[PDB]
Write a protein that binds this ligand. Sequence first.
Ligand SMILES: CC(=O)N[C@H]1[C@H]([C@H](O)[C@H](O)CO)O[C@](OP(=O)(O)OC[C@H]2O[C@@H](n3ccc(N)nc3=O)[C@H](O)[C@@H]2O)(C(=O)O)C[C@@H]1O
Lengths: 245, 241
Amino acid sequence: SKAVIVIPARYGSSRLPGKPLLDIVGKPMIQHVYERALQVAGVAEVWVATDDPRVEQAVQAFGGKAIMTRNDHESGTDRLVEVMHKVEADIYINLQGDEPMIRPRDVETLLQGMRDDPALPVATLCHAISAAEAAEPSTVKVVVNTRQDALYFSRSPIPYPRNAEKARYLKHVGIYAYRRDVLQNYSQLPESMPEQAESLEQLRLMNAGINIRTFEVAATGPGVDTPACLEKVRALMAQELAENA
Amino acid sequence: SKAVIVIPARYGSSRLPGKPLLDIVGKPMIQHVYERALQVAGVAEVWVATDDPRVEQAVQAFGGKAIMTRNDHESGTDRLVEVMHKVEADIYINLQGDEPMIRPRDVETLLQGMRDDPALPVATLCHAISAAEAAEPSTVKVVVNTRQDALYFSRSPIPYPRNAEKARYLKHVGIYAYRRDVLQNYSQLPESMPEQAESLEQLRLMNAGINIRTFEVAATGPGVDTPACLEKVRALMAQEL
Ligand SMILES: CC(=O)N[C@H]1[C@H]([C@H](O)[C@H](O)CO)O[C@](OP(=O)(O)OC[C@H]2O[C@@H](n3ccc(N)nc3=O)[C@H](O)[C@@H]2O)(C(=O)O)C[C@@H]1O
């Protein structure tokens, strides 16, 4: 069971031009993700999927494996489908190029889940959040069953707080593990109405009846999206260097 | 493939004591549901499951069939489980005793769905509602996949309208069809967190991985829970004559 980690890293960003190349304690952000991806036990290779030559250069510059992909890709999953044809593996893990604080152990939890059940097509992560955080549309919530299979994903607060004290929210962490056959059949799947409404790509899989198991982990580090969170990451990353000295 | 219709009709109600016996244009509400239930092709028997003698005798008076059930049940579903032990069938349809405007056709759509797919455990109904109606916590929304299987049931507006013009809403109509084996195992299912939070009993089935297919029908008529709706239903059923 060969498994590879793919890291989509596109330069063009609205509120942060050249986001993967931003410096964090002396290294480009993309490098931090790559370095952490390398610490994940059970992974054969680690690739960075990109559509910008500057990003490709920066990755090769530190000895990382880069693979150019089309720029006309509407979704980040289509990008993984293109990489799938060239890079062979049984399990593909999609890490986000803008989360430098990813814990290698969480990705191993994901990978182990995929290996413990050969019939599981897709797997993802989630963690507990308060009711106040769950109210944010920018935050994606998820509800699971006893087998931890996802029932639905939404920007709306679910479950609804009818009996407020009984509600427990789970924030969806955008890291996925896909079986090879799911990616082979992906481009044939049509866009669902909930997907287009919520603007959540993962609902395309649920429309087709593809099961997505969601594993719970502790609260994840703050992902870099705003310069306010960027400084917190820089200081939180630097605080980590001096603690492990 | 034997199918029977069960109509839960408890005497009590916080806003309308003795609700099933309330007169709607000449007949008690329960009689309207029972008569319409008898018009559903494919059903072998129709029973009113009640907890009060005054309701039982009222049903027997007009010719219907009634069965006494315990008074400590908190849900119409639990009451149905008690009936399943006395009345044998392969498929049980649970109609609400306070919806006298039920269309016999919609129940047949439900029954046909169950018969076309022997592997389907539970089936229910739904209809389209505007985005405005979807915002109400009292209106239970549902989202389905291509095979029309329910993804989730919620009082929250789902799907979330990030792209408003793309969102389409579905209101859940509380009529169910259960395969016998589902009822035999019901008492063993544990209450779920989403069930307790949303206060929606059907989420107990989804928590267990039991598939619920939702068939779409046209907008249904109002039920009788408040004395405001009772006057509305009397008005609607008077002009329907
Ligand atoms: C399908 C549905 O929506 N049912 C709801 C009904 C009515 O159909 C609606 O007004 C239509 O929009 O109204 C409510 O009825 P009840 O609270 O009485 O409960 C449903 C049903 O189950 C029986 N029952 C209830 C409680 C207990 N402990 N045991 C029972 O056996 C009742 O007799 C009734 O027939 C309402 O608003 O009050 C809610 C229903 O979900």
